């Protein structure tokens, strides 16, 4: 009966190392509306901003969790989502090609 | 404005 969230991990602008940008993790299509979403830098949590809860025509919810960041060739970024429709937390690493 | 009248279902 629950619906599982779809996840997209991406940057606002095309990424070049050094030149700063914003990291996004868009979580949508899920139900019921309680979740935890996190952006992770090499597994460590980041201080982040979460959008306000809204929903689509099919009533499923969407949220955006975002933060400034600076890409390197040595750092790794992922988004950790947990929902009641998931048996356990899911991580989606950030590949600069989503 | 948010609507000023909500009726409980």
């Amino acid at each position: 009966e629950p619906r599982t969230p779809k996840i997209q991990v991406y940057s606002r602008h095309p990424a070049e190392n050094g030149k700063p940008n914003y990291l996004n993790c868009y979580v949508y299509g899920f139900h019921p509306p309680q979740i935890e979403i996190d952006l992770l830098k090499n597994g460590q949590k980041m201080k982040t901003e979460q959008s306000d809860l809204s929903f689509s025509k099919d009533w499923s919810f969407y949220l955006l969790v975002h933060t400034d960041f600076t890409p390197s060739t040595v750092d790794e970024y992922s988004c950790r989502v947990n929902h009641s429709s998931l048996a356990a937390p899911h991580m989606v690493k950030w590949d600069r090609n989503n | 404005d948010y609507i000023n009248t909500n009726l409980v279902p």
Partner: protein, 279 residues
Amino acid sequence: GFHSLRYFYTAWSRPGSGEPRFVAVGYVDDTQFVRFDSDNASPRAEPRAPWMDLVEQQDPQYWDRNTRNARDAAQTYRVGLDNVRGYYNQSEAGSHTIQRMYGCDVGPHGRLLRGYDQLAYDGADYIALNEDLRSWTAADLAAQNTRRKWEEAGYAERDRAYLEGECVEWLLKHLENGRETLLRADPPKTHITHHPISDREVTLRCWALGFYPEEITLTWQHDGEDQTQEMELVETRPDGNGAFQKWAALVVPSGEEQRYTCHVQHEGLPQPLTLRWEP
């Protein structure tokens, strides 16, 4: 070419926390401008768009009046959780959700196209205001309880009053005061990427970045033949600065990239574009 003022309510009880939460946000088109969430100290309606930083000038009580309306709304729909939960003889243990969506579609010069007020319980349609705005349709038996209650209380007359007057007038207010943001058509920056899979296969991806509003149509064609069903279409996403991104990909025999063309439709473009990949 209409515009919309839409309000999205969410009330939900969750397993590990007594007392349900209430979220109330409002949109003009694809632009959020206000929020309310009861998980705060003294929960207040707050601005979420630049032009609403100015709204206290022309309406000093806007924040107080809208904080009043949302805090009352939070209360009635926390009781509504209990009511509907009882209609379905569900237990206090579970976690349930009531959602509300109401607003109006206005035509070119203050012309109400449609008004609506819809309610879902645990993500399924429960009750909705008919297009005539003088009647409801109920989903199941438990919703008939509500419709009979609301018919008695004549709540459609109060609903149509807001939707016909107040909704329209506030959309026009917001469109004029938020002109720089709301009456804007940002065409996308489009470009195609090339990612090979093997010796014989290739993935061609058609990007579209920084466009507003959200509505867009990406389309891959092969010698003019439509290839939507063989397409991999990402769901459109926000970028964080108030715009949206989207791409469509399709797999093609290598060395034949140039027989395929991407087709972009957006309100902000003078006329649709047909794209092609070039070394």
